[PDB]
Write an enzyme that holds these catalytic residues in place. Structure first.
Site, PDB file in Angstrom:
ATOM      1  N   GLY A  18      10.233  -0.297  -1.957  1.00  0.00           N
ATOM      2  CA  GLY A  18       9.387  -0.768  -3.048  1.00  0.00           C
ATOM      3  C   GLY A  18       8.837   0.193  -4.076  1.00  0.00           C
ATOM      4  N   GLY A  20       4.883   0.138  -6.538  1.00  0.00           N
ATOM      5  CA  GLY A  20       3.601  -0.567  -6.658  1.00  0.00           C
ATOM      6  C   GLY A  20       2.758  -0.224  -7.884  1.00  0.00           C
ATOM      7  N   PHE A  22      -0.443   0.972  -8.412  1.00  0.00           N
ATOM      8  CA  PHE A  22      -0.795   2.377  -8.255  1.00  0.00           C
ATOM      9  C   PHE A  22      -0.237   2.840  -6.901  1.00  0.00           C
ATOM     10  CE2 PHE A  22      -3.316   3.022 -12.015  1.00  0.00           C
ATOM     11  CZ  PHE A  22      -3.875   1.780 -12.303  1.00  0.00           C
ATOM     12  N   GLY A  23       0.951   3.438  -6.955  1.00  0.00           N
ATOM     13  CA  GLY A  23       1.617   3.945  -5.763  1.00  0.00           C
ATOM     14  C   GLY A  23       3.075   3.549  -5.601  1.00  0.00           C
ATOM     15  N   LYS A  24       3.688   4.082  -4.544  1.00  0.00           N
ATOM     16  CA  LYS A  24       5.066   3.782  -4.187  1.00  0.00           C
ATOM     17  C   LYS A  24       5.072   3.205  -2.781  1.00  0.00           C
ATOM     18  CE  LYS A  24       6.670   7.436  -7.171  1.00  0.00           C
ATOM     19  NZ  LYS A  24       7.742   8.419  -7.506  1.00  0.00           N
ATOM     20  N   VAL A  25       6.250   2.842  -2.280  1.00  0.00           N
ATOM     21  CA  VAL A  25       6.352   2.318  -0.922  1.00  0.00           C
ATOM     22  C   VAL A  25       7.641   2.819  -0.292  1.00  0.00           C
ATOM     23  CG1 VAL A  25       6.295   0.269   0.554  1.00  0.00           C
ATOM     24  CG2 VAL A  25       5.101   0.233  -1.632  1.00  0.00           C
ATOM     25  N   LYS A  39       2.639   2.760   1.923  1.00  0.00           N
ATOM     26  CA  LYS A  39       2.234   2.525   0.546  1.00  0.00           C
ATOM     27  C   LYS A  39       1.521   3.744  -0.061  1.00  0.00           C
ATOM     28  CE  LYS A  39       0.916  -1.756  -0.397  1.00  0.00           C
ATOM     29  NZ  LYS A  39       0.070  -2.986  -0.325  1.00  0.00           N
ATOM     30  N   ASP A 134      -6.033 -12.045  -5.741  1.00  0.00           N
ATOM     31  CA  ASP A 134      -4.675 -11.786  -6.164  1.00  0.00           C
ATOM     32  C   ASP A 134      -3.698 -12.425  -5.202  1.00  0.00           C
ATOM     33  OD1 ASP A 134      -2.935 -10.286  -8.135  1.00  0.00           O
ATOM     34  OD2 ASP A 134      -2.235  -9.354  -6.271  1.00  0.00           O
TER      35      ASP A 134
END
Lengths: 288, 77
Positions: A18, A20, A22-25, A39, A134
């Site tokens: 993935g 995101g 604010f961020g990656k996965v 995450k 959300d």
């Protein structure tokens, strides 16, 4: 702080799954053989801290089969990763449109199991004064036997009065799912999630995993749309995919009757995620 | 036009103290289809230009939106 289910520095990153807000996965196998989701939130720490924290406190209560369960965290050396059970099937949207995924599509049942499943998910959080804010197809991961699990709580809020909280803060959520009332007024309730659910509801019925698609006519907001159909203009059976003549005439009139009830102009006239969870089952019942 | 219009909006943002760097972050978040978190300043500036924003909300191909993304990106520098 109050916690110590805290893992520390694994390996170097094998670019995977993935990406995101604010961020990656990343998909990273652990020392014990466990399939775990990571995450990492070091990309753009644009207040990616408060979210990170709220997702630790709000989720360290990880006691449910319809929520993504968090294993650990890490605040070591400026980094702030989060650890979860890897979800074999990805989110729900990836099974409703997106692109690819062989063996054709989901059944109506499989769709309903996942509609009801997701509902307990929210209902629970509304039982615990938690607004998710959300709720969306992407946030509803599935596992090995297609069991729904809610995720990304980062935007979520908690209440005092335990349920009956009608609190007000800054407006947040995904532009198509957001409660319009919430948006126009600012007053946030637990129903604003019910609205968002009504949206997913159809997003399952229709497979218009677009919710808001800016290419057809003034039929753009699936919420505004399926409403004008099943609220009045036609009880349209034309809105759905190659779902075929699989849905019973009666279960369908319920499944929507509710999804429309979720999208009422005011939260006032929405049903608590309790009813919605009963009605859902009832229609899965109505079907077989 | 669109480049002329877009500028009007960057102007407001700056004239209304809105930290335009953040405003960009939300316009990215909005078009991608990611959870947005506008400020009171920013959110009411936008609804003037994107009326159907509550429901339809800043598309990818919306000309003005594309222009505004740039019109901001430049001004940040």
């Amino acid at each position: 702080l109050v916690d110590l289910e805290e893992a520390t520095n694994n390996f170097d990153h094998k670019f995977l799954i993935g990406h995101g807000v604010f961020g990656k996965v990343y998909k990273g196998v652990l020392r014990d053989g466990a399939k775990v989701a990571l995450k990492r939130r070091t990309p753009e720490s644009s207040q990616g801290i408060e979210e990170f924290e709220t997702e630790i406190e709000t989720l360290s209560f990880c006691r449910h089969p319809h929520l993504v369960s968090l294993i650990g965290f890490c605040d070591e050396r400026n980094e702030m990763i989060l650890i979860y059970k890897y979800m074999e099937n990805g989110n729900l949207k990836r099974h409703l449109y997106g692109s690819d995924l062989p063996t054709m599509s989901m059944s109506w049942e499989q769709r309903l199991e996942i509609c009801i499943g997701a509902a307990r998910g929210l209902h629970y959080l509304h039982t615990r004064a938690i607004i998710h804010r959300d709720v969306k197809s992407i946030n509803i991961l599935l596992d090995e036997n297609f069991v729904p699990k809610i995720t990304d709580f980062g935007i979520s809020k908690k209440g005092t009065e335990l349920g009956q909280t009608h609190l007000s803060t800054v407006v947040k959520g995904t532009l198509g799912y957001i409660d319009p009332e919430y948006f126009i007024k600012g007053r946030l309730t637990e129903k604003s999630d019910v609205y968002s659910f009504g949206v997913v509801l159809f997003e399952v019925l229709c497979a218009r995993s677009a919710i808001v698609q800016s290419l057809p006519r003034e039929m753009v907001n699936l919420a505004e749309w399926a409403v004008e159909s099943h609220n009045n203009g036609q009880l349209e059976q034309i809105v759905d995919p190659n779902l075929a003549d699989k849905i019973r005439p009666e279960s369908l009139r319920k499944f929507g009757d509710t999804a429309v009830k979720c999208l009422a102009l005011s939260s006032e006239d929405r049903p608590s995620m309790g009813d919605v969870l009963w009605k859902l089952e009832y229609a899965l019942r109505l079907q077989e | 036009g669109a480049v002329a219009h877009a500028n009007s909006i960057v102007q407001q943002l700056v004239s209304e103290g809105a930290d335009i760097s953040h405003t960009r972050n939300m316009l990215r978040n909005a078009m991608n289809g990611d959870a947005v978190a506008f400020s009171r300043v920013e959110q009411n500036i936008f609804r003037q230009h994107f009326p159907n924003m509550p429901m339809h909300g800043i598309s990818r191909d919306s000309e003005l939106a594309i222009e505004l993304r740039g019109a901001l990106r430049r001004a940040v520098h």
